[PDB]
Design an enzyme around this catalytic site. Structure first.
Site, mmCIF file in Angstrom:
data_model
loop_
_atom_site.group_PDB
_atom_site.id
_atom_site.type_symbol
_atom_site.label_atom_id
_atom_site.label_comp_id
_atom_site.label_asym_id
_atom_site.label_seq_id
_atom_site.Cartn_x
_atom_site.Cartn_y
_atom_site.Cartn_z
ATOM 1 N N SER A 139 0.846 -1.190 0.000
ATOM 2 C CA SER A 139 0.000 0.000 0.000
ATOM 3 C C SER A 139 0.886 1.245 0.000
ATOM 4 O O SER A 139 2.022 1.176 0.422
ATOM 5 C CB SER A 139 -0.884 -0.019 1.250
ATOM 6 O OG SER A 139 -1.532 1.211 1.518
ATOM 7 N N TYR A 152 -2.725 -1.286 10.940
ATOM 8 C CA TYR A 152 -2.659 -1.539 9.478
ATOM 9 C C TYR A 152 -1.400 -0.911 8.839
ATOM 10 O O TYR A 152 -0.726 -1.534 8.038
ATOM 11 C CB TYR A 152 -3.936 -0.971 8.826
ATOM 12 C CG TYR A 152 -3.961 -1.017 7.298
ATOM 13 C CD1 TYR A 152 -4.296 -2.186 6.631
ATOM 14 C CD2 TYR A 152 -3.638 0.108 6.542
ATOM 15 C CE1 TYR A 152 -4.314 -2.240 5.245
ATOM 16 C CE2 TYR A 152 -3.617 0.058 5.152
ATOM 17 C CZ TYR A 152 -3.983 -1.117 4.506
ATOM 18 O OH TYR A 152 -4.013 -1.188 3.129
HETATM 19 C C1 BM3 Z 1 -6.611 1.995 6.394
HETATM 20 C C2 BM3 Z 1 -7.035 1.339 5.088
HETATM 21 O O1 BM3 Z 1 -7.585 0.238 5.113
HETATM 22 N N1 BM3 Z 1 -6.759 2.042 3.966
HETATM 23 C C3 BM3 Z 1 -7.109 1.580 2.604
HETATM 24 C C4 BM3 Z 1 -7.932 2.638 1.873
HETATM 25 O O2 BM3 Z 1 -9.065 2.992 2.678
HETATM 26 C C5 BM3 Z 1 -7.033 3.861 1.589
HETATM 27 O O3 BM3 Z 1 -7.718 4.788 0.773
HETATM 28 C C6 BM3 Z 1 -5.731 3.392 0.901
HETATM 29 C C7 BM3 Z 1 -4.665 4.458 0.769
HETATM 30 O O4 BM3 Z 1 -5.332 5.705 0.841
HETATM 31 O O5 BM3 Z 1 -5.115 2.359 1.689
HETATM 32 C C8 BM3 Z 1 -5.963 1.306 1.836
HETATM 33 O O6 BM3 Z 1 -6.034 0.276 0.845
#
Ligand code: BM3
Ligand code: BM3
Ligand code: BM3
Ligand code: BM3
Ligand code: MAN
EC number: 1.1.1.233
Lengths: 257, 260, 260, 260
Positions: A139, A152
């Site tokens: 990510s 996370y």
């Molecule tokens: C905390 C979390 O689960 N973030 C998600 C998504 O909601 C976000 O948009 C993304 C990065 O912005 O990361 C992720 O894939």
């Protein structure tokens, strides 16, 4: 097809990115195991035929599912470790032991266990003129932190350095290891993932392309990193975020201001 | 002194970097708890007086107990240096066992989390920010938080974890008056003997890969812990100070004039 | 003082960060030349005494002349802070003119190169390393050395140039006893007036994108210039100290509790 | 083919990477202008048919002329690969001359700027975005965009420049339907002879510092130029694809099993 005759396992294969990757892999000629929770596999359909579903639970379960998957494919050329718990919890001050352990155990340790099993199977199956391929899904949170999601975010930094340590140690065994780092990706199928008004405003400010990505826009990189041509690419990250991580003060740009 | 009147906890305080940090903090006027394993604390001496030793074990019950005791004795908390860490490699990733994985992740990643959550809550309880100045959390990561050494996947992964934990802490704790940063050391000789990197193949690779051509000393890392804890560093948060003699800045250093 | 007896040149010494650095250096016991444009030096006062003003113009002829004069008056050179810089945007990349490109690259990238080459040669001439301690070059980059603001492509490109120049200098000058590091400031209010970031849309984006929710002050940057110049920072080279209130550590800051 | 019907300009098209890119693009169904110095174009043959050679001199007048001619012959512009580059080191930073500095900055940084500004304007003139698909600018940087080799400060600085240019372009051109990304190659053998990295000390350091233990081939870089130009890469902008056999991911590679 660009993956003609390759054997692939994709974890998190019911979810958005995992699903799009299964479909792109089948479309490019690979034989594909789709691995995810039993219920989720039951509830999904693929727009391409050929997927071999195998239920799993991201330790005994992981080994069993991977052994079964390799048995049915007759080997292993490609692993996409896409299994992941997403979401935030609240401020770090109130972060509980249970939430910490769940994100670290599922996302970090689950990805380790899956990738160790995959790597050993790849070596057993004779990996290496051409190399087997491990692809982890991290990510932009592997590098920069969102608010209220410390468990996370930490796990994602863990996955990013695991990926590099894997690249270094497995190069001698004919395996290339890379990460894909998505920014915001709409997984609703409905264009409603980032529709909450404050969130949609911040997407417009912080993403240069002004929108969330689609799962297909991430899957394309999983094909690139699995194909024969990518044979000098290892220990790296392909970031797929519409410019999010490249930009500061994007709310000030012409067209937004 | 630059830390005059501040209350500090330093974990891993028997070890090289932790020890050098306790000494620099005492020298700069801080009240300091030195936390580490009971045996190790028993076996250490500090070159500066005033350290309050408190035994701990990075279970979770142990961490909370030791932190509560520390804050009670200090009468508050302004500075946390989370220096507790298991170091070392295991072998190739193919043969990395569940036990080795769990130990590095549980001690280095989860141990740092538990310590920093306890610390942050104590800082808030003690009124962080109230006078316009901010409390300070300082984590000790590594160049391995960004680039991998061979045969140490469990340790390297945990260090990436600590680096992003640090940034997530910085973001969430800014509103509570706490600044959070990481120190990333390269090779540091902790022998006191200049023998830490003396194995011949290793000493050759240090000469090639570190621009200054040597390992660092624990004191060279402690100086950054003072900088990040002092009042002047009030706009610095979510950042890394890298202390590695140019290791992470250079490629093909074996080819440079003086080496080749 | 922490810089007691050291000889330092600070360029851009009339401007906010440069001025705060001159003052911090004087306060820590250094002899300091303040270098900037003649008019600007004429129009500035320092809150600390001792600054040796020397006019310069970041021609190449001018830079060498000014640096030779400065080193002559100091009797050597231990510390260079290359703070001279043109700031500001131009408009969209599509309309960016040759003249704007050349001016940002020439003044910020080439002017930093010329100044640092002159400085480094003087440091070697004056015996850098001889006493077991190292001379120090400190460049002032930006968060724009790593991530781009909109409508400022020339300035952003030059800052990436300065960031890599800094690393290349670290690598090549390590053998000559010189440590080289960059300071990367985020938004800094240089008005003295708390009005730098007061335009309403801008102020809103600073609240969203900076974890501490405000611009920095020049003094909050100068403090790092002292840290990087002092004897204790002897294993730190090729690195960046980022001073941005968490800007570069955070994404979706507008979503955080206290902002949404 | 994955680029069926797209119009592409590739600069540095006689050289290794540029040549391999022209061939991959022809093989994937694109119409391709091959731009490079007149002599070099004269001296090259492509293993695929269809290349439209156009002489240029990365000479600002020359660049505009060549780009206008190229766009005229293609009837538009969907894809630019800015591969023109001077490579090589000079010696220590202390001895780096004004002429070497200017040649690397002017040819590699400014030449890439002028080429990409021309390309982007043509793309907008030709209707980039109208059908919902985006035009594509791809710059060729280097691992030296992020970490420095010894004795090549001018080349390394310029590469940092090109990296941040790439990001500033991504940000400003998103609204105009153009995606902009960099490819960062590690060591690449461009001899056709397997002799590029055969000097014994160099070959030893490649084994130590590259995880795959060899240099790359030009084809191994070109493949990423196809990926970044195709329709599927529609959410990728402002990023880098690093192609270096693990060089930038690893530290102390000389210590790994199989090398020590
Ligand atoms: C905390 C979390 O689960 N973030 C998600 C998504 O909601 C976000 O948009 C993304 C990065 O912005 O990361 C992720 O894939
Ligand atoms: C695996 C491990 O514990 N690494 C140590 C040390 O051996 C290394 O020299 C240093 C990074 O190079 O990281 C560390 O501090
Ligand atoms: C265009 C430009 O000169 N940017 C400035 C300033 O405006 C910004 O606030 C700062 C942080 O983004 O970078 C810079 O120092
Ligand atoms: C000095 C120089 O021009 N560096 C080149 C090449 O020679 C190197 O092999 C490569 C990897 O270090 O960087 C670069 O692409
Ligand atoms: O100089 C040691 C060196 O190891 C590698 O070659 C690279 O990853 C560099 O970043 C690192 O600095």
């Amino acid at each position: 097809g660009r993956l003609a005759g390759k054997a692939a396992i994709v974890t998190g294969a019911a979810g958005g990115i995992g699903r799009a990757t299964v479909e792109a892999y089948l479309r490019e000629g690979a034989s594909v195991v789709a691995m995810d929770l039993a219920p989720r596999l039951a509830a999904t359909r693929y727009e391409e035929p050929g997927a071999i579903p195998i239920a799993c639970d991201l330790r005994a379960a992981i080994d069993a599912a991977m052994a079964d998957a390799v048995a049915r494919l007759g080997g292993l050329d490609i692993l996409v470790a896409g299994g992941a718990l997403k979401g935030g919890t609240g401020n770090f001050l109130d972060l509980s032991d249970a939430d910490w352990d769940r994100y670290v155990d599922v996302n970090m340790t689950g990805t380790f266990l899956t990738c160790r099993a995959g790597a050993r199977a790849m070596v057993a199956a004779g990996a290496g003129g051409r190399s087997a391929r491990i692809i982890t899904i991290g990510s932009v949170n592997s590098f920069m932190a969102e608010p209220e999601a410390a468990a996370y975010v930490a796990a994602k930094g863990g996955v990013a350095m695991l990926t590099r340590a894997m690249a270094v140690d497995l190069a001698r065994h004919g395996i290339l290891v890379n990460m894909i780092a998505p920014g915001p990706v709409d997984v609703t199928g409905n264009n409603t993932g980032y529709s909450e008004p404050r969130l949609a405003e911040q997407v417009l400010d912080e993403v240069a392309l002004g929108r969330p990505g689609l799962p297909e826009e991430v899957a394309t990189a999983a094909v690139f990193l699995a194909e024969d041509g990518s044979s000098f690419i290892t220990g790296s990250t392909i970031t797929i975020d519409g410019g999010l991580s490249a930009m500061i003060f994007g709310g000030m740009r012409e067209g937004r201001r």
